[PDB]
A paper describes a structure:
One class of assembly cofactors are the ribosome-associated GTPases (RA-GTPases), a subset of P-loop GTPases within the TRAnslation FACtor associated (TRAFAC) family, of which the proteins RsgA, RbgA, Era, and HflX are members. RsgA is a nonessential, highly conserved late-stage 30S assembly cofactor that has been implicated in the docking of helix 44 (h44) of the 16S rRNA into the correct conformation and therefore correct maturation of the decoding center prior to subunit joining. The overall structure of RsgA consists of three domains: the N-terminal OB-fold, the central GTPase domain, and a C-terminal ZNF. Both the OB-fold and the ZNF domains are involved in nucleotide recognition and target RsgA to the 30S ribosomal subunit, where they contact major helices of the 16S rRNA.
To look more at the mechanism of (p)ppGpp-mediated inhibition of RA-GTPases associating with ribosomal subunits, we solved the structures of RsgA in both the apo- and ppGpp-bound states by X-ray crystallography in order to compare to already-available GMPPNP- and GDP-bound structures. The 1.94-Å structure of RsgA complexed with ppGpp reveals the presence of the nucleotide unambiguously represented in the electron density map, whereas the apo structure at 2.01 Å lacks any electron density in the nucleotide binding pocket. The ppGpp ligand is bound in an elongated conformation, where the 3′- and 5′-phosphate moieties face away from each other. The guanosine-5′-diphosphate backbone interacts with the G-domain in an identical manner to the more well-characterized GMPPNP, with the P-loop/G1 motif stabilizing the α,β-diphosphate and the G4 motif specifically recognizing the guanine nucleotide base. The 3′-diphosphate extends away from the core of the protein, toward the solvent and appears to be stabilized only by a long-range 5.5-Å electrostatic interaction between the lone electron pair on the ε-phosphate of ppGpp and the basic lysine residue K116. In our structures there is no electron density corresponding to the Mg2+ and the switch I/G2 loop is unresolved, likely due to innate flexibility when not contacting a γ-phosphate. In addition, the switch II/G3 loop does not appear to form hydrogen-bonds or electrostatic interactions with the ligand. In contrast to this, the GMPPNP-bound structure features a fully docked switch I/G2 loop, positioned adjacent to the bound ligand and the binding site of the Mg2+ ion, although the Mg2+ ion itself is not resolved. Crucially, in this conformation, the docked switch I/G2 loop occupies the same space that the 3′-diphosphate moiety of ppGpp would. Compared to our apo - and ppGpp -bound structures, the switch II/G3 region appears highly similar to that of the GDP-bound structure, leading us to conclude that the OFF conformation is maintained whether in the apo state or when bound to either GDP or ppGpp and that the switch I/G2 loop would remain disordered in the absence of GTP.
Numbering used by the authors: 1 to 180, 201 to 288
The structure:
């Protein structure tokens, strides 16, 4: 009996990594049904057969998961944004953060293409990134003069998934891990996923009421709003509006919250 992570799902066979060693397995029990089907990222217990094969007996309860692509137990969602081509957008970033937190994921922020960003713009982006650091995120701003493999290995242990639009620079990182459905590649201290989590933006699962939970500073300062479910829009005695007023929440963050709050409700 062995325990490990699914790094590949190929026509119903599940490659499980156990500290480097690969085993090709098939589900048994409940796990043969679509409704309980294993997914890449799952931690499983399997019985070994035929030296490098096995039967999955148990799939451990998922800590989190994405549906498209289907991938589970992500330890850090790295949101990849370009500084230029296309221009850095707090509007897009904030949205990608809302999605990440709606899936219960640890997020961090990676801005790319520093080498081709005008230096005055670099300075403006660094200030913006400091706001995100204030909220609690780790941020990096990198370009072609940086060692992308040192960057990745210094990230937290476990499963990293990159998320961002085509063109931001994800493959440039991933090509460092390629043996050369989502597939996970090995890194020292974990894995990194071959597909992004959410190149695009899907809010369908999100209720207007949850949006404040996913703006972390609003959630935190919302603690001392008079109303326990204050949405920080028209309510009296609102600590988010107070903190906004005395400069402890950025106006753009509040503006984006409002926009999303109003947008989210609407019909598609
Ligand atoms: N200057 C600079 N460019 C970056 C950086 N990161 C990524 N790029 C470039 O941006 C483009 C998209 O990168 P990918 O790595 O393919 O992005 P993706 O997977 O998110 O879609 C590529 O350029 P391309 O269209 O292939 O043209 P070229 O730049 O290869 O000449 C890539 O080389 C960076 O940090 N600095
Ligand atoms: Zn409030």
């Amino acid at each position: 009996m062995k325990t490990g992570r699914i790094v590949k799902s190929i026509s119903g066979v599940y490659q499980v990594d156990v500290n480097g060693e690969r085993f090709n397995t098939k589900p048994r029990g409940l796990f043969r049904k679509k409704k309980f089907s294993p997914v890449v990222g799952d931690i499983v217990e399997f019985e070994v057969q035929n030296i490098n094969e096995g039967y999955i007996h148990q799939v451990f309860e998922r800590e989190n998961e994405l549906k498209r692509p289907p991938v589970s137990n992500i330890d850090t969602l790295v949101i990849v944004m370009s500084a230029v081509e296309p221009n850095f957008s707090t509007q897009l970033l904030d949205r990608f953060l809302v999605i990440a937190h709606s899936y219960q994921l640890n997020a961090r922020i990676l801005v790319t293409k520093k080498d081709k960003t005008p230096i005055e713009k670099q300075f403006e982006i660094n200030e913006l990134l400091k706001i995100y650091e204030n909220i609690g995120y780790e941020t990096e701003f990198i370009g072609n003069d940086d060692d992308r493999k040192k960057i990745v290995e210094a990230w937290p242990a476990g499963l990293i998934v990159l998320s961002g639009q085509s063109g931001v620079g994800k493959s440039t990182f991933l090509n460092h891990y390629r043996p050369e459905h989502v597939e996970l590649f090995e890194r020292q201290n974990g894995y990194i996923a071959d597909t992004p989590g959410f190149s695009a933006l899907d809010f369908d699962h999100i209720d207007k009421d949850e949006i404040k939970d996913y703006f972390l500073e609003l959630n935190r300062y919302g603690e001392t709003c008079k109303f326990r479910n204050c949405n920080h829009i028209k309510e009296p005695n609102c600590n988010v509006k107070h903190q906004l007023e005395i400069g402890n929440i950025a106006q753009f963050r509040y503006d984006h919250y409002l926009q999303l709050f109003n947008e989210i409700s609407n019909r598609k």
